[PDB]
Amino acid sequence: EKALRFLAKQTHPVIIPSFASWFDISKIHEIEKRSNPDFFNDSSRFKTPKAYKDTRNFIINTYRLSPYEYLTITAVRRNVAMDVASIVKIHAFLEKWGLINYQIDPRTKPSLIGPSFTGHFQVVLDTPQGLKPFLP
Amino acid sequence: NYEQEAQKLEEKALRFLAKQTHPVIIPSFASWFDISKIHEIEKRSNPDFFNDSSRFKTPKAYKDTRNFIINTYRLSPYEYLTITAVRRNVAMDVASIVKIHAFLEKWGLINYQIDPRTKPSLIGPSFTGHFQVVLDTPQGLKPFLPEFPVNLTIKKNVYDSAQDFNALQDESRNSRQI
Amino acid sequence: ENNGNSVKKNWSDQEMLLLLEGIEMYEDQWEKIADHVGGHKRVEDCIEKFL
Amino acid sequence: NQLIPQAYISNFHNRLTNEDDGIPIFTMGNAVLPDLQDQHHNPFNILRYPKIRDTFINGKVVSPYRLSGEAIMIPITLDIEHMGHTIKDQFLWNYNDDSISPEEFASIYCKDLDMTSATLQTQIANIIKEQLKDLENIAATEIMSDLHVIINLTCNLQDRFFEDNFQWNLNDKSLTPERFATSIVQDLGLTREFIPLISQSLHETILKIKKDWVDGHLIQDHVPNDAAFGYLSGIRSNWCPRVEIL
Amino acid sequence: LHPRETLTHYLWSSKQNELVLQGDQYFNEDAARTSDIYSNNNNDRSLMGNISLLYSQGRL
Amino acid sequence: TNWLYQHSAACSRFNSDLFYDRVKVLLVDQQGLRDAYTNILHIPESTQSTTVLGWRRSKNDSPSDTSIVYETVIHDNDLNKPKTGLSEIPKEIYEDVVDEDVLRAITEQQNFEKCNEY
Amino acid sequence: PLNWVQGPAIFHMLTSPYTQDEIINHEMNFLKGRLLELQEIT
Amino acid sequence: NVFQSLPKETARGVDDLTRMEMALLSGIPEEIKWSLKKYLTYSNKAPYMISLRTLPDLLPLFKTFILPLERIVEGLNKSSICDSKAMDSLQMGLNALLILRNLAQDTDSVQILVKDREIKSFILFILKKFQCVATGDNKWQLYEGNATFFNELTHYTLDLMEAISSYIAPAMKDDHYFQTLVSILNYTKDRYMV
């Protein structure tokens, strides 16, 4: 009633992996019902399933509008009025099944700032009679 | 296209490698440790992360702060790493990060007071062999490829003997021939 | 000669001669042998070549 | 010979009082560090970098200091003026754990600052004892009944003030706020020092709100304001984070 | 009674005792006056690797 | 109308804006940072190859040689299938699935991901 | 409480036999040459 | 200038006693061999350095080698020691048993060994198996090829029983130590053991 136009006008075409062929864009079913069951078994007044429908549609279509960039958690939090503790659940759920961060430019994914990786560094051993190299 | 993308990935991977200039000495009894996986000595000395008692102490956060401490030590080996320098960068409670720092200093993985000029050198294992460490592809330098198991040696390096393996001399002595 | 020779473990006749001159000189003191060879060889290789 | 010893340099306090490095602890090619550039196996080359002969010239020699079913996290602020220079920082504390005493943390924390005045330790430990004993039965709560409060949040770090808005459910315990601040700083590209400083500025607000659920017991679970997309169907979100330099 | 873990014991211990008896064959008269110990026997590796240690102890 | 498209386009512009912010400062302008507490150049983790796989042995060509060849290498399997992790899912969930070749594709992707070693 | 102390002189003999009668003379010489060197410290 | 004021006492790495104490606490087997050899040398030549009164966190570090030797003694009636991995554990256990035998002639390293209620279970176990050898009972007949593994196993236990018996000075009626040794005395032919 409102998203038909939005899927029609400005959405880049659908790319979906083979182990996501069980996905249903219309309604939900038992996989999403048993993975995160808090939206269904009366957790609160807020977590009714229709809001879950609206948020999963908004996330997957927001990835449809730009399939070559990583859809981050903050950029969907700007216009989804829901718990951040459930935005994280739905976002990790949809990324986990390879739907909405599947085929992207790999230099778009946010990585945490940190020091370099020292695994290829050379270590030498402090043997009690010398300094033999550490070569397994 | 595959050869050019492989050469491109090799170039922009050697661009980010953190080349070694300082040797790192660990004590011989702490040779059980590996950067990648968690050993059973760490699982019985710090059980608070593996009992699933609290929510703020998972093995993933343990491994992240452990690799953080060891990687910020080995890039500057000559400098004594302190607790306050680590506490401002990692988000854990203070007691646990003090436990992990005292653990890593107990085994001599960090902060190992030694002067290697007053000890000899040895040849323990065999002489020859193409010792090649196998890393992973850093996801972020992968090719774009809008629609291939190529392995690439980044840095070749030869050593004549263990005495120049211990001091990081790569037969550059043809430059400085004394 | 005075020039730096080729890649190590070649042992040209000049270096063999100077090694044997050093062993006739000093009878010990392998630092004073290895510099008399030319100083571009270690003690731990002059002993491995005289044996 | 010709090998650097593995330790014995602890040039940390001079970078605390460098006045170029933006450290808020004290008051009174074109790269900078060779962690991506080889030096062709001469250590002397590392003396061309201007922050590294700073740690060999101005360095000193240090001696190494030698040494429950549910954690309860309590944020602790620290604000002490002492001989012109001050100390303003913040850190969490595990109330259920007692493996380290605040006297021992005061002896450790005073040693990196290179004060060792033997009376800063007592003052720091008394402030920590005070802020722990003031909050012993306010962070041990068992909150139910779906509060879902709104949170404005600010962070002060050297005229680079962080501020954001979000809806929070403090009834489920799935989302660690340290993981939340990690997800923020991964996205905005900030330095790693904002990783504790947001979460340490969040737990306090959690026990500010928890406070009103227990002390006055004011429920006031009435319309957390939204934008008619999620929970409360107005017509069928709030804001976004930012870093403002004042 | 149980033949498996005594034949494995035989195949282990006979091999180990053969190695122990063949631990002494390069210390003869005319096997040490010649040169086929020091040169080219990196296959052996046992001696001529102690020379980095024995000079550092002053024995020579 | 004109609500939901406007909101989703604003989300995508905000996403690309955060990307163009985070890519210039860290990697392009000065290629890293500098921690003030420790003299360590911070770098984004995506260019760093987090794990380390097994070792490999060999021998040099000429016998009776004493030289050591220490080196590195990269490795991956096929470098095109991504790492959307299905192994962090228990095996009791996806057994009321609709098809059987869907189950085969899930097991194929999981057996691909468990071949991180060589 | 730490005290960085020099350890005792342990007689590690160069050649190591196994029968006792090939050891006792060397160990007597070690006991004499240690207790005489140590007696002057008192 | 900063590389001139190094403390001379710590510029060799760690000291050897902490090296020996950490080497056993790891799991590297050759470094365990080195640590046990050096503990044996220091126990023979200067036992007061490894006096249990001084270093209290050292006796469980030997219990963790001596206590899994009971399974080996149980399985020693057949040719059990097949590979080169169980034998190394056997030799480490016998060497740690010798170290605790050598520390038990001190009268201050002895009361800590007596007050432990688990070393005496091992002594009683070894003596019960040697009583099964000395009587000739059909249960647990000794395999002869393991006999040199067992013989020096039972000379290092009696020397503990010779040292701790003064602290078992109240003798009961139906005692197992007294019954076992009075069974052993009829069998043996060693002057030292008698």
Coordinates of C-alpha atoms in Angstrom, one line a residue, chain F residues 18-104:
Chain F
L18 CA 29.7 8.3 7.2
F19 CA 31.8 6.2 4.8
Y20 CA 33.3 9.2 3.0
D21 CA 34.0 10.7 6.4
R22 CA 35.7 7.6 7.8
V23 CA 37.8 6.7 4.7
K24 CA 39.5 10.1 4.2
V25 CA 40.8 10.7 7.8
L26 CA 42.2 7.3 8.5
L27 CA 43.5 5.8 5.3
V28 CA 43.9 8.6 2.7
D29 CA 45.0 11.8 4.5
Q30 CA 47.8 10.5 6.7
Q31 CA 47.4 6.7 6.4
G32 CA 46.9 5.8 10.0
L33 CA 46.9 7.7 13.3
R34 CA 49.1 8.0 16.4
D35 CA 48.1 6.9 19.9
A36 CA 49.2 9.5 22.5
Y37 CA 49.4 6.9 25.3
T38 CA 51.7 4.5 23.5
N39 CA 53.8 5.3 20.4
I40 CA 51.8 2.9 18.2
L41 CA 50.3 3.8 14.8
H42 CA 46.7 2.8 15.0
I43 CA 45.2 1.5 11.8
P44 CA 41.8 0.0 10.8
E45 CA 41.6 -3.7 11.4
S46 CA 40.2 -4.6 8.0
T47 CA 43.7 -4.3 6.4
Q48 CA 45.5 -6.5 9.0
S49 CA 44.7 -10.2 8.5
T50 CA 43.4 -11.0 12.0
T51 CA 44.1 -14.7 12.3
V52 CA 47.2 -16.8 11.4
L53 CA 47.0 -20.3 9.7
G54 CA 49.3 -23.2 9.9
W55 CA 53.0 -23.4 9.1
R56 CA 54.7 -25.0 6.1
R57 CA 58.0 -26.9 5.9
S58 CA 60.3 -27.5 2.9
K59 CA 64.0 -28.1 2.1
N60 CA 66.5 -26.0 0.1
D61 CA 67.6 -27.2 -3.3
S62 CA 71.4 -27.8 -2.7
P63 CA 72.2 -30.2 0.1
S64 CA 74.8 -29.5 2.8
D65 CA 73.6 -25.9 3.1
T66 CA 73.1 -23.8 6.2
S67 CA 70.8 -21.0 5.0
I68 CA 67.4 -20.1 6.6
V69 CA 64.6 -18.9 4.4
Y70 CA 61.9 -17.3 6.6
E71 CA 59.0 -15.7 4.6
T72 CA 55.3 -15.1 4.6
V73 CA 52.3 -15.8 2.3
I74 CA 48.6 -15.0 2.1
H75 CA 45.9 -17.6 1.5
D76 CA 42.2 -17.9 0.8
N77 CA 39.7 -20.3 -0.7
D78 CA 38.3 -18.9 -3.9
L79 CA 38.3 -15.3 -2.7
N80 CA 34.7 -14.6 -4.0
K81 CA 32.3 -16.3 -1.6
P82 CA 31.9 -14.0 1.4
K83 CA 32.1 -14.9 5.0
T84 CA 28.4 -14.5 6.0
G85 CA 28.8 -16.8 9.0
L86 CA 26.3 -19.6 9.3
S87 CA 28.6 -21.7 11.6
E88 CA 27.5 -19.4 14.5
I89 CA 24.1 -21.1 14.4
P90 CA 23.1 -24.4 16.2
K91 CA 22.2 -27.3 14.0
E92 CA 18.7 -27.7 15.4
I93 CA 17.2 -24.5 13.9
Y94 CA 17.2 -25.0 10.1
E95 CA 15.6 -28.5 10.0
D96 CA 12.1 -27.4 9.5
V97 CA 13.3 -25.7 6.3
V98 CA 11.2 -25.7 3.1
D99 CA 13.5 -27.5 0.7
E100 CA 16.3 -30.0 0.7
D101 CA 18.7 -28.3 -1.7
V102 CA 18.4 -25.3 0.6
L103 CA 19.7 -27.5 3.4
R104 CA 22.4 -28.7 1.0

